[PDB]
């Protein structure tokens, strides 16, 4: 659980040009004598947060920018401080994607969007609408072919259709109303229903994954796929005559892909930060570094202006950027992980018939909102307990649940602190909480005490009640500013460790019901 000094270990996804990246790594070694090892582990985006938390993991991690806010919030990423001469070399909007709480937390590499990829020998004129695909499949079935196959196991691929008629993740208005989540509105239902009808009508198969769709397209069995620039390499190898074009419309509106910026972050625990900065700035993020990677697997529209000027002339890149402009740049906020996990489950379940569309997307909504809803409740309870007066500000979206949960919490939590005063007092003294630093350390003890045994609402109340007990203390010793970080810490333990149980209860609505 310690990163070796004097070399660089890099993680990148197995669908990217890791062989090309290693070539850049060989050029680095040739100059510096430093060995660069490139790995592509399965589920690297899930592994990185676990291993980095213990001071382990790679020196550099590559992923789309959406995951990096969560990493940064957890303290896992070194701040990046390029000089102006280096910053000026990349498009300002790519830097924006890797900015979190005012600070740059990675190097942007390339802009990625999904496009429609089509076999020009089977389909000289690709469909402009989703709606015409059923009839097109019927035509192609008569030839022993099919219209469309794409990965149905990852929600990234289905999201453009879900968002077309009005589905959205976190509402953007001045900022991201994390409280306003749009995964179960009429637009999202209409899009996912269209997909589920395609499967029911035998135009697609719920089990199709990345590998199956890729093989089917690259063997000329299906006339269309939906994929990103990284996929073009393998299609070149297959010698399918393909084009890349704008995704189909749904209900007269453009498909709206979530746009990712492939980004390179530096592990906060790396003893090799200067090596990493040197590698990224002066080897990778150059014309020749990016070309080496791009020649292995296309990056998309790269962040480096000098090299993108060349790539932009490619009609596949123009198509990529057209789709991107119709879509939206992903948030990098910490709750994106939870959003993706919820929507993944919803798509799979609706596709398989395990849930209806309405059942599936309702669960997704609950799952995506759970962090913020929980924090509203816990923060307000903590602060009103500590100060003696309630917060007057409006709840917001799903404000009844919040209000009702806080009402219930007050009633059911009243007993608890009195009833367990002695044990709460004893635990308080052993913890010796004095400052914000102490608060940040509590996470481990807290997890431990809330571990094992059973899960029920009473125990959740006990968790939060001790929270309020600590908050009251923090206020009396003039550390009122520590209550909000205490609330965040309790929320994080709750929603992570109890996610599936919470969603099963219909979230905080279950709580209000249970103590009715
Ligand atoms: C093992 O299975 C259990 C355990 C519990 N309990 C009882 C005791 C151990 N307990 C519990 C909590 C809430 C979870 C942790 O809460 C926090 C802890 C820390 C360190 C922080 Cl900083 C914060 C903000 C919250 C307790 C919280 C405080 C104390 Cl002092 C105790 C406690 C008591 C009472 N006696 N002792 C010796 C201690 C250490 C806390 C906790 O989860 C269970 C259940 C089921 C329930 C229930 O139905 O209510 N409870 C409360 C359980 O499953 C069998
Ligand atoms: O499906 C959810 C998944 O979507 C995105 O991951 C993409 C990634 O951006 C692409 O570069 C490519 O590798 O395909 C992935 C989908 O399989 C998000 O970036 C990711 O965080 C999320 O889990």
Ligand 2 atom nearest the C-alpha of 154 is 1
Helix (H, G, I), strand (E, B) or coil at 498: coil
Residues 196 and 350: beta-carbon distance below 8 Å: yes
Q: Report the distance separating Cα 222 and Cα 106, nearest Å.
A: 38
Q: Virtual CA dihedral for 42, 48, 53, 57, nearest 10 degrees? A: 90
Specify the resolution in Å. Answer: 1.9
Q: Whose CA is nearest to atom 47 of ligand 1?
A: 459
Residues 299 and 262: beta-carbon distance below 8 Å: yes
Q: Report the distance separating Cα 103 and Cα 273, nearest Å.
A: 17
* Structure token pair of residue 467: 């929270």
Ligand 1 atom nearest the C-alpha of 445 is 20
Q: Whose CA is nearest to atom 36 of ligand 1?
A: 423
How close is the Cα of 469 to the center of ligand 2, in Å? 41
Neighbours of 471 (CB within 10 A): 27
Homologous superfamily (CATH) of 370-514 is Blc2-like (1.10.437.10)
Q: How far, CA to CA in Å, does 17 sit from each of 21, 177, 234, 289?
A: 6, 36, 11, 12
The topology under which CATH files domain 8-112+260-312 is: D-Maltodextrin-Binding Protein; domain 2 (3.40.190)
Find out whether the beta carbon of 449 lies less than 6 Å from any atom of ligand 1. yes
How close is the Cα of 304 to the center of ligand 2, in Å? 22
Find out whether the beta carbon of 112 lies less than 6 Å from any atom of ligand 2. yes
Say if residue 246 is exposed, middle or buried (CB neighbours under 10 Å; 0-12, 13-18, 19+).
middle
Residues 114 and 323: beta-carbon distance below 8 Å: yes
Q: Report the distance separating Cα 379 and Cα 16, nearest Å.
A: 42
What DSSP assignment string belongs to 245-303?
EPPPEETTEE--PEEEEEEEEEBTT-S-HHHHHHHIIIIISSHHHHHHHHHHS---EES
Find out whether the beta carbon of 13 lies less than 6 Å from any atom of ligand 2. yes
Q: Report the distance separating Cα 199 and Cα 84, nearest Å.
A: 52
115-256 maps to which CATH number? 3.40.190.10
Q: What share of the chain is helix, strand, coil (3-state, %, to 5)?
A: 55, 15, 30
Helix (H, G, I), strand (E, B) or coil at 209: coil
Tallying the residues shown for the chain, one arrives at 516
Q: What angle do CA 415, 418, 423 make, to 5 degrees?
A: 120
Choice from 374, 415, 452, 459 to test ligand 1 binding pocket (greatest atom count within 8 A of CB): 459
Tell me the β-bridge partners of 301: 111
Q: Whose CA is nearest to atom 5 of ligand 2?
A: 156
Find out whether the beta carbon of 250 lies less than 6 Å from any atom of ligand 1. no
* Structure token pair of residue 505: 């209860």
Tell me the β-bridge partners of 259: 329
Choice from 260, 327, 346, 367 to test ligand 2 binding pocket (greatest atom count within 8 A of CB): 260
- List the chain domain ranges: 8-112+260-312, 115-256, 370-514
Tell me the β-bridge partners of 146: 222
Find out whether the beta carbon of 470 lies less than 6 Å from any atom of ligand 1. yes
Experimental approach was X-ray
Find out whether the beta carbon of 490 lies less than 6 Å from any atom of ligand 1. yes
How close is the Cα of 464 to the center of ligand 1, in Å? 10
Choice from 424, 429, 466 to test ligand 1 binding pocket (greatest atom count within 8 A of CB): 466
* Structure token pair of residue 215: 């093989």
Let me know if the fold of 8-112+260-312 is the same as that of 115-256. yes
């Amino acid at each position: 659980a310690k990163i070796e000094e004097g070399k660089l270990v890099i993680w990148i996804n197995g669908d990217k040009g890791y062989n090309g990246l290693a070539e850049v790594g060989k050029k680095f070694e040739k100059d510096t004598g430093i060995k660069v090892t490139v790995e592509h582990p399965d589920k690297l985006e899930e592994k990185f947060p676990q291993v980095a938390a213990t001071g382990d993991g790679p020196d550099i991690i590559f992923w789309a920018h959406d995951r990096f806010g969560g990493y940064a919030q957890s303290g896992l990423l070194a701040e990046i401080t390029p000089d102006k001469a280096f910053q000026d070399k990349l498009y300002p909007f790519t830097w924006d994607a890797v900015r979190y709480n005012g600070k740059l937390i990675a190097y942007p590499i390339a802009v990625e969007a999904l496009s429609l990829i089509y076999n020009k020998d089977l389909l000289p004129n690709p469909p402009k609408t989703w709606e015409e695909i059923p009839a097109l499949d019927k035509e192609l079935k008569a030839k022993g072919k099919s219209a469309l196959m794409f990965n149905l196991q990852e929600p990234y691929f289905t999201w453009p259709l879900i968002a077309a008629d009005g589905g959205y993740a976190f509402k953007y208005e001045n900022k991201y109303d994390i409280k306003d989540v749009g995964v179960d509105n009429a637009g999202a239902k209409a899009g996912l229903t269209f997909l589920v009808d395609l499967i029911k009508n035998k135009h697609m198969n719920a089990d199709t994954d990345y590998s199956i769709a890729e093989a089917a397209f690259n063997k000329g069995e299906t006339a269309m796929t939906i994929n990103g620039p990284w996929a073009w390499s393998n299609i070149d190898t297959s010698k399918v005559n393909y084009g890349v074009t704008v995704l189909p419309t749904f209900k007269g509106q453009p498909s709206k892909p979530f746009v990712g910026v492939l980004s390179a972050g530096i592990n906060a625990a790396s003893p090799n930060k200067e090596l990493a900065k040197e590698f990224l700035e002066n080897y990778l993020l150059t014309d020749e570094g990016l070309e080496a990677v791009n020649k292995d697997k296309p990056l998309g529209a790269v962040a480096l202006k000098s090299y993108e000027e060349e790539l932009a002339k490619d009609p596949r890149i123009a198509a990529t950027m057209e789709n991107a402009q119709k879509g939206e740049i992903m948030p990098n906020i910490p709750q994106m992980s939870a959003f993706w996990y919820a929507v993944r489950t919803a798509v799979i379940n609706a596709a398989s018939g395990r849930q209806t569309v309405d059942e599936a997307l309702k669960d997704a909504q609950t799952g995506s909102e759970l962090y913020r809803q929980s924090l509203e409740i816990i923060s307000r309870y903590l602060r009103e307990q500590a100060t003696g007066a309630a917060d007057t500000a409006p709840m917001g979206a799903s404000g009844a649940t919040s209000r009702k949960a806080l009402e219930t919490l007050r009633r059911v939590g009243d007993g608890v602190q009195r009833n367990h005063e002695t044990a709460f007092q004893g635990m308080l003294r052993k913890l010796d909480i004095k400052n914000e630093d102490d608060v940040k350390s509590l996470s481990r003890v807290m997890i431990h005490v809330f571990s094992d045994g059973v899960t029920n609402w009473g125990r959740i109340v006990t968790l939060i009640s001790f929270g309020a007990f600590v908050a009251k203390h923090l206020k009396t010793i003039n550390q009122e500013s520590c209550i909000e970080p205490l609330a965040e810490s309790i929320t994080d333990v709750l929603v992570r460790t109890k996610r599936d149980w919470l969603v099963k209860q219909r979230g905080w609505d279950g709580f209000v019901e249970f103590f009715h």
